[PDB]
Short mmCIF file of C-alpha atoms in Angstrom, two decimals:
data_model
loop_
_atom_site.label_atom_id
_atom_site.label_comp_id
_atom_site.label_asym_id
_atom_site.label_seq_id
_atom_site.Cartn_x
_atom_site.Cartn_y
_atom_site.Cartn_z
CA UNK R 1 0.00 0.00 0.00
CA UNK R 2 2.07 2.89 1.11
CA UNK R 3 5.28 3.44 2.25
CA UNK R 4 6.91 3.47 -1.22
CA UNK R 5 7.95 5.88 -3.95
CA UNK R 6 5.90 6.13 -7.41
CA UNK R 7 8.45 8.06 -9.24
CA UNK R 8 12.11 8.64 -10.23
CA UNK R 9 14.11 11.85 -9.90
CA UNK R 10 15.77 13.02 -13.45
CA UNK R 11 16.60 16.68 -14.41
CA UNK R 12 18.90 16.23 -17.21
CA UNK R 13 19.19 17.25 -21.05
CA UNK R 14 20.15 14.68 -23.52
CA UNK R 15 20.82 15.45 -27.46
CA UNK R 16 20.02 12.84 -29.92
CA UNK R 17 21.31 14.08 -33.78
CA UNK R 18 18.84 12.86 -36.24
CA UNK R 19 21.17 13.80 -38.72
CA UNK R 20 20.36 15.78 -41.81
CA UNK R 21 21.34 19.06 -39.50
CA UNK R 22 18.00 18.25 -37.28
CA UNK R 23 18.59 17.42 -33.39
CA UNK R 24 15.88 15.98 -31.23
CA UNK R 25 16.22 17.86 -27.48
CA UNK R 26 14.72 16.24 -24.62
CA UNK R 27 14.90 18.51 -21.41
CA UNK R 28 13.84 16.47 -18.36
CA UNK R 29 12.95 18.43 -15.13
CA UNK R 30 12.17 17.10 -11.78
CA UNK R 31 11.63 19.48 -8.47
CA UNK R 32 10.13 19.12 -5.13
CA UNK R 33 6.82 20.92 -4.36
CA UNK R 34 5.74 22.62 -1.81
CA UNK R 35 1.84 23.41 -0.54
CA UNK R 36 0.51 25.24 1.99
CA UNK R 37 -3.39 24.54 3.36
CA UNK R 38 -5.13 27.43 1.31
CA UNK R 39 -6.36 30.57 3.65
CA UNK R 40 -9.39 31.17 1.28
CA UNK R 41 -11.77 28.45 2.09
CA UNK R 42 -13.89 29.25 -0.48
CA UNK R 43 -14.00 31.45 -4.30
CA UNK R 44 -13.47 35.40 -3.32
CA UNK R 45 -13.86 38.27 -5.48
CA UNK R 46 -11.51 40.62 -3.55
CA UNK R 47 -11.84 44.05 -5.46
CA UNK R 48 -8.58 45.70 -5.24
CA UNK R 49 -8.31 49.75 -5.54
CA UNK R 50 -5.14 51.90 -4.57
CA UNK R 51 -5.50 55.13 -4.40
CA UNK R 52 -2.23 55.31 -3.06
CA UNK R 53 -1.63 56.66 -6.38
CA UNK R 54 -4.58 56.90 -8.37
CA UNK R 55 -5.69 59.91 -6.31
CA UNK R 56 -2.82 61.91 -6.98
CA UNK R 57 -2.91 64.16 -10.39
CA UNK R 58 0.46 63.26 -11.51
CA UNK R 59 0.42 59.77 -11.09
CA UNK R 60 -1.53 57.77 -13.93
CA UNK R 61 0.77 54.69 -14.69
CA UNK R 62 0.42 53.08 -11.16
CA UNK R 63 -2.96 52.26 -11.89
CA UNK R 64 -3.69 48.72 -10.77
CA UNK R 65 -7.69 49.11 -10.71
CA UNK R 66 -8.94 45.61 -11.25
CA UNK R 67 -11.03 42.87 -9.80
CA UNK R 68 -9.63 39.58 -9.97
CA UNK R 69 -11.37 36.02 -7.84
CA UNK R 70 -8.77 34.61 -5.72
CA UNK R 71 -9.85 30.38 -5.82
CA UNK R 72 -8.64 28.31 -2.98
CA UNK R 73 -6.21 26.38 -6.07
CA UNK R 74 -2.38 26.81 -6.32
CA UNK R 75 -0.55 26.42 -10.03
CA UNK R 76 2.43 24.39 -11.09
CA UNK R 77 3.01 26.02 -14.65
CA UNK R 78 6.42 25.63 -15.02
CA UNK R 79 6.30 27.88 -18.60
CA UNK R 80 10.06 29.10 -18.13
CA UNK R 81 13.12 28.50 -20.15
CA UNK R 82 15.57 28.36 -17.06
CA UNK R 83 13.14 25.63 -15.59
CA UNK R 84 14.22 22.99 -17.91
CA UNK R 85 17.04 23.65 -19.92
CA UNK R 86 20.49 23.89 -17.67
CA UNK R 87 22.66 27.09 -17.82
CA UNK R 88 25.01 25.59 -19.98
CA UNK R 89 23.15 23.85 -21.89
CA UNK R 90 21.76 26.99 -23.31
CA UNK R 91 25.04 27.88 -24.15
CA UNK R 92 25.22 24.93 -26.51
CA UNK R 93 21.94 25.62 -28.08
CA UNK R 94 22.43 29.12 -29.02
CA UNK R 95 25.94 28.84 -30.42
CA UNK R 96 24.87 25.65 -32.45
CA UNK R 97 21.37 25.76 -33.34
CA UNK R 98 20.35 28.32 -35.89
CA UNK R 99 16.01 27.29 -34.80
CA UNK R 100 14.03 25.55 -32.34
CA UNK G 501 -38.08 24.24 -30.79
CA UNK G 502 -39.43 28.24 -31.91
CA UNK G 503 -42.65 27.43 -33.37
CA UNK G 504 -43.74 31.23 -32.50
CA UNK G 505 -42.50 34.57 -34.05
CA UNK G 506 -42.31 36.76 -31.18
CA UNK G 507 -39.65 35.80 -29.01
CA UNK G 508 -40.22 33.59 -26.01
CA UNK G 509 -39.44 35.04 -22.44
CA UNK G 510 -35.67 33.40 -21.38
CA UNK G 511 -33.67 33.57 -18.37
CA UNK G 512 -30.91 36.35 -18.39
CA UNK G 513 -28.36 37.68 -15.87
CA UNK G 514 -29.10 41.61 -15.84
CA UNK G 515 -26.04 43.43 -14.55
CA UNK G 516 -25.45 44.28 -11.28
CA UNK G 517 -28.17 45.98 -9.28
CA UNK G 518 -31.35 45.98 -7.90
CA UNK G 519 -32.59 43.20 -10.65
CA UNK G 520 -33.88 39.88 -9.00
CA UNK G 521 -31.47 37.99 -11.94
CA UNK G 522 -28.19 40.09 -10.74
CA UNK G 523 -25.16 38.81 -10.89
CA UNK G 524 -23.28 39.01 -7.78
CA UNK G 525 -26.11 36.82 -6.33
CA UNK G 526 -24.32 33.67 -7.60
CA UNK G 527 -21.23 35.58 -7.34
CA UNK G 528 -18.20 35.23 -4.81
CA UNK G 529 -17.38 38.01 -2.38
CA UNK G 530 -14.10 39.94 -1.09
CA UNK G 531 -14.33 37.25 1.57
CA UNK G 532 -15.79 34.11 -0.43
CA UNK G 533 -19.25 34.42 1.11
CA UNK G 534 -21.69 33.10 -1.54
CA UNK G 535 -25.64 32.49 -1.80
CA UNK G 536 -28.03 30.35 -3.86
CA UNK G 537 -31.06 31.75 -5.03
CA UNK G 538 -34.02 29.91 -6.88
CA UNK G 539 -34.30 29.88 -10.36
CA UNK G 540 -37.37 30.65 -13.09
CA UNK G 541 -38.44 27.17 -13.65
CA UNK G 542 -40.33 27.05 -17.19
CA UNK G 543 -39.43 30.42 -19.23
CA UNK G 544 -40.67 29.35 -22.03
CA UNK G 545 -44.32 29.37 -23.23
CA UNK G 546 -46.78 26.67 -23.69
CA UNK G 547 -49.93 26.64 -25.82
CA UNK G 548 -52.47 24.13 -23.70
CA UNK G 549 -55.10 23.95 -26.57
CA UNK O 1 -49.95 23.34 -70.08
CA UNK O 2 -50.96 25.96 -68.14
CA UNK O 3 -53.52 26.57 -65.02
CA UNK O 4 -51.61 24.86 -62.35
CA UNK O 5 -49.43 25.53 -59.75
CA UNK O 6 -45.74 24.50 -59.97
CA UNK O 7 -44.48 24.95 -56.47
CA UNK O 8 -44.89 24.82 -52.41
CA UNK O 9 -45.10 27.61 -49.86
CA UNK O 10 -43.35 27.02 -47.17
CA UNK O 11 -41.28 29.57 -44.50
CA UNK O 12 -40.30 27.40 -41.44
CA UNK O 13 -37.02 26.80 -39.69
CA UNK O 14 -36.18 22.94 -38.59
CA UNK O 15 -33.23 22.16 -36.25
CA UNK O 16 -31.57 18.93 -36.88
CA UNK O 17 -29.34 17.92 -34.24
CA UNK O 18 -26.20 16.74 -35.83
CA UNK O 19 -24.68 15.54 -31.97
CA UNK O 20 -21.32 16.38 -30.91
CA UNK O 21 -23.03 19.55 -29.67
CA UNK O 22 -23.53 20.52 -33.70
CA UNK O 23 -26.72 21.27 -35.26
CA UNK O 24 -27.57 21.54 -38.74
CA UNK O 25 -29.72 24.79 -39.18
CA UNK O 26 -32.30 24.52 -42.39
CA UNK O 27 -34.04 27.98 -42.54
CA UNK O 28 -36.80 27.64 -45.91
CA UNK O 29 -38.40 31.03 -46.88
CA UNK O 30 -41.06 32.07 -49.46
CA UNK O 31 -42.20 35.06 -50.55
CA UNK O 32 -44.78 36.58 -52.97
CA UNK O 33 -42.66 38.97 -55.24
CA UNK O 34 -44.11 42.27 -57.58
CA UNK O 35 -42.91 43.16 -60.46
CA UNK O 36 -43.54 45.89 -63.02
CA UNK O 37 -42.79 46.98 -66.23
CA UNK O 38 -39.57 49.06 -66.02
CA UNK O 39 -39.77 52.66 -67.27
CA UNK O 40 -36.07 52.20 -68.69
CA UNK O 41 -36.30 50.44 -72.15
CA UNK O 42 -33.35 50.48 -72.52
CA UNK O 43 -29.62 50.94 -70.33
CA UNK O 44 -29.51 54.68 -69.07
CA UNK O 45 -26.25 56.41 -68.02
CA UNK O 46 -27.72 58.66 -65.62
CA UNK O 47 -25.63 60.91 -64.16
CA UNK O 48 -26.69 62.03 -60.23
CA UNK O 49 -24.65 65.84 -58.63
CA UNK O 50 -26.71 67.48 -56.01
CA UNK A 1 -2.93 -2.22 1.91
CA UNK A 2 -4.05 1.00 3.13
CA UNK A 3 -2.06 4.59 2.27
CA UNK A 4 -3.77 4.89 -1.07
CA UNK A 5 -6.56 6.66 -2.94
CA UNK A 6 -9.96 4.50 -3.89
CA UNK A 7 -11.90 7.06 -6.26
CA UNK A 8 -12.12 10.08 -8.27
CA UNK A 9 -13.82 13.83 -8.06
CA UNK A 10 -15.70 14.63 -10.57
CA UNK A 11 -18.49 17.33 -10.54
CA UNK A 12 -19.21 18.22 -13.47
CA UNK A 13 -22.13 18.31 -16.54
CA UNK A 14 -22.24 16.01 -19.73
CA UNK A 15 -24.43 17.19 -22.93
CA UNK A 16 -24.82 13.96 -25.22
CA UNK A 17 -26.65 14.81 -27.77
CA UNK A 18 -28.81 11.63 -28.90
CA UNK A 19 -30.38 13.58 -31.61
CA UNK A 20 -33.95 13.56 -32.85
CA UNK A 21 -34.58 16.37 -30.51
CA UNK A 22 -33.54 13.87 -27.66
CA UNK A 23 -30.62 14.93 -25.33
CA UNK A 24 -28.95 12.44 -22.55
CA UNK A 25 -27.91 14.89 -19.44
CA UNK A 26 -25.22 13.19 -17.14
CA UNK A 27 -25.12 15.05 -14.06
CA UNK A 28 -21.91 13.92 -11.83
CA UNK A 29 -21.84 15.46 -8.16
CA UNK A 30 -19.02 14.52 -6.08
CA UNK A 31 -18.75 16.05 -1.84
CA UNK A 32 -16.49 15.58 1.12
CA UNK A 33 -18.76 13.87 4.09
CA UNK A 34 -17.70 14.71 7.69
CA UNK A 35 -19.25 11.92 9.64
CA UNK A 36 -18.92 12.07 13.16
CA UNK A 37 -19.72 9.37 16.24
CA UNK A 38 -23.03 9.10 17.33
CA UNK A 39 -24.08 10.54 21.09
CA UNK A 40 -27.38 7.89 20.99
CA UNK A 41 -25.45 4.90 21.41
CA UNK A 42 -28.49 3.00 20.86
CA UNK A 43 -32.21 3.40 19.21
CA UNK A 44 -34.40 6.07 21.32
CA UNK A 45 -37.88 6.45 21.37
CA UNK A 46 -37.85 10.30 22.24
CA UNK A 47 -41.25 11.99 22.88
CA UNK A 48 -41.50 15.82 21.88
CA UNK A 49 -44.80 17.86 22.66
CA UNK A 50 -44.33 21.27 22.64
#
């Protein structure tokens, strides 16, 4: 039952040439999570308005009027470059690679 | 299916306000506070004869 | 020859659903149309400059 | 043994549309239960009159 792993831990970058100039990349990432009980029990529609800023005349940029719903639901999007790739890798890739 | 030419009476969401059908009724709140409130049951029209 | 009718009148709108959550839409229309003579006999170049 | 899941949440709405103006609705509905020990340890026969 439990008391056992159901995974394996692999955060490498391996290049396999399919020859004719074309290179198939595989980036593997593995990281550890971390969660936290949510605060908001429930759906909220916190309305957020600083007029910190907005009041004053000269100040029209620092606007962040809006109205978002904060949901009791974290995110793992892990939509960054550095994320997956390694820092040399990139190196590689750049120098080599004329598209990807 | 529309067997009639003047349109039949449907349920809408009318902006927020003093409408019955607002919104924020079945909307969250700053804190997360929410209500259920009943629904028109049969909007649509029926000829009996 | 002639004294007969040589068509149907009909201006409904039937909704087959297709599944899949598409429908196929068939809207039939008929009208009665008037025409008369045109006053032009012929092409006119008529040229309008309030 | 025990340490591991047994079902699935789902709570959602299905549309099939079986055509012929005929539509199969799948509701699924799925809740956390918080059960908690009984005080009547045994079946009463209480007797209310207000």
């Amino acid at each position: 039952g439990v008391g056992v792993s159901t995974g394996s831990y692999d955060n490498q970058t391996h290049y396999r040439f399919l020859g004719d100039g074309w290179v198939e990349i595989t980036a593997l990432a593995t990281r550890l999570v971390h969660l936290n009980m949510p605060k908001s029990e429930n759906y909220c529609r916190i309305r957020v308005h600083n007029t910190t800023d907005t009041s004053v005349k000269g100040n029209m940029a620092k606007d962040d009027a809006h109205e978002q719903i904060w949901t009791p639901w974290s995110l793992v999007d892990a939509n960054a470059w550095g994320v997956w790739l390694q820092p040399s890798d990139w190196q590689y890739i750049c120098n080599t690679m004329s598209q990807l | 299916a529309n067997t009639t030419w003047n349109p039949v009476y449907q349920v809408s969401a009318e902006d927020n306000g003093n409408s019955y059908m607002s919104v924020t009724k079945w909307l969250p709140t700053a804190t997360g506070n929410m209500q259920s409130v009943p629904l028109i049951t049969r909007p649509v029209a029926r000829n009996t004869y």
